[PDB]
Symmetry: C3
């Protein structure tokens, strides 16, 4: 049918489509047992007065185990599930260079070594290399350095420092553990506001923001995980954003599946 190919190096994991509703669009891998497989619940909406879209991905990953060899008479069974959701907000009258920049920053956010250690080894964000706690988001040769402005007990807010003060980049990380200390909750969020000024056109006009576009994340990690269970969940989501189909889902609003 319609497939997405997630290259995790030389191993390619092909998800095939099992559902096509008007908005929801469920993919699933077909290799292995039937009880625990990959899942990709894509979506698209336009809520309100037709002015803002809402992309919504959700990459589940179940850790199935089958030990009928050891104990006689059992079947394969799912231990836990670890998800990595996305919540993109795109306003309808945007510039295509603003939708491309929001994709290129989040593709480089996931591909850095500070978000990798945040979901694998639970290390918080920011490494001080001669100065403040900074994150570097390379968009090729252009590097956009975000310095930390606030670190309370829950939140950890990063922000770029160049340009005007009214519209700047953001990175609101946090980390929780809800329930009986059994599952964590990583929560990244990158705000990009588009600022414009026309003081060469209209006198007395200071810069102001016209719209904002977000890209949230919501990672769920159970506490007694395997390390290669969290490492493979990161490597699939890093390879999901790097595809050419999630690029067109954000830039041109084309649904997934080729």
């Amino acid at each position: 049918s319609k497939t997405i190919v997630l290259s995790v190096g030389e191993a390619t994991r092909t998800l095939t489509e099992i559902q096509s509703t008007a908005d929801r669009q469920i993919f699933e891998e077909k290799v292995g047992p039937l009880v625990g497989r990959l899942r990709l619940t894509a979506s698209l909406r336009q809520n309100g007065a037709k002015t803002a879209y809402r992309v919504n991905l959700k990459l589940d990953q179940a850790d199935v185990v089958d030990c009928s060899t050891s104990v006689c008479g059992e079947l394969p069974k799912v231990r836990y599930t670890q998800v990595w959701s996305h919540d993109v907000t795109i306003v309808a009258n945007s510039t295509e260079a603003s939708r491309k920049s929001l994709y290129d920053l989040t593709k480089s956010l996931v591909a850095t070594s500070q978000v990798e250690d945040l979901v694998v080894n639970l290390v918080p964000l920011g490494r001080a290399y001669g100065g403040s706690k900074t994150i570097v988001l390379s968009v090729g040769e252009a590097t956009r350095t975000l310095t930390e402005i606030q670190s309370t007990a829950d939140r950890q807010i990063f922000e770029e420092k160049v340009g005007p003060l009214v519209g700047r980049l953001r990175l609101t990380a946090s980390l929780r553990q809800n329930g009986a200390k059994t599952a964590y909750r990583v929560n990244l969020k990158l705000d990009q506001a588009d600022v414009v000024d026309c003081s060469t056109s209209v006198c007395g006009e200071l810069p102001k923001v016209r719209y904002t576009q977000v890209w949230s994340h919501d990672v769920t990690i159970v506490a007694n995980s395997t390390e290669a269970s969290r490492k493979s969940l990161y490597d699939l989501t890093k390879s999901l954003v790097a595809t050419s189909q999630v690029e067109d889902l954000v830039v041109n609003l084309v649904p997934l599946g080729r």
Copy 2:
């Protein structure tokens, strides 16, 4: 009349006196339009039972724009104002080296590259160069390194670590935004307590503080500013503290203007 010269390099900006009351003393620049100019409302008091003075400067700066060329029939007008207040507290029975050291620390506080980025690019204080978040306040060849002891969501307290524990240098920076997110509020404050020990004179006497002398700051920065509007406000205040008249205003209590 009576002038102060604030050299910002080779460009010298001379403010002339427009008011002289018993305590208040207003200066103003005379070059340019008549609606928005520099302002410097110096003051001096002795509150309470005549034991402590209170120096109080306030360097205003308005950004005037005139575009009668663009739209026909308008007059010059100011958009915003950005101030940099001071609040020096001097106790009357001080040592002359106590008042000189308080001036020599604040003259080197404003002249550093960390307070410059705090008002221009809104970067918080302290850069960790192999260790803790530190600020170096050199007074020539003597460098006084203040290490950060507490970073709350509102305050950011620095303190020196060499010497006794009863009296040490302090630096409680802050950053707010009051109202509808339109104006910031930077707030530095440097406490210097005079400690003395008499153990070579009287036995069993541990060190203790005599008095404290404060040099606070209160910078008001509007959010939609120009970068050269925030840079020139800092570079005028850096050149104001480095003059010989604000030295004698703190050390010898001579009012401004010669």
Copy 3:
């Protein structure tokens, strides 16, 4: 009688026993005046249903001053007292390598240069050397690096990052000042949980913790101390943990004094 030898370099300070109850065991140094001397109040218990022990050391130190040659007719007298308690919790069914590793980490916790500046110069913990704020607890050639996970206004929690997420090292430092700003209170605490994985024996078994063994600290430092008064209290406690008698008090529960 029964002695403990604390080498503070080449000078050895020998404390002799002055009390031996069923649990409490008080030592005291015998040189100098009779009003202020070293004091070491060891103890051992097993509270509850005989499942966990509780070691409790307390190294007092009083600063005695005698200036009868200054003022005619006074006697020696103590100004202040600086203590360093310990509170070790050992569960009875432990492994001997678990009790040895807990002693080897605390012996290396006290011997580092970051805890020395915490009690002498009141500098907080953690120095960022290319990355985040880390503490290195070397056990010889094995180095166990704990990275900071939370810096509240009171607490400062460190944690190791390798291995599973369910049981890791901990270091919750704190710093208070109770009363009329006269005395500080340093409080270190190292948690070590024993985690086991039975996946090679029982299928579908994720790692879990068996027990926890703590080693708290409680340093009391008065604010008007001498520097060599706080330096000698640290250098005695560093020389107390490194002895062979406090090793056997934690590993083999042998009481102090040979």
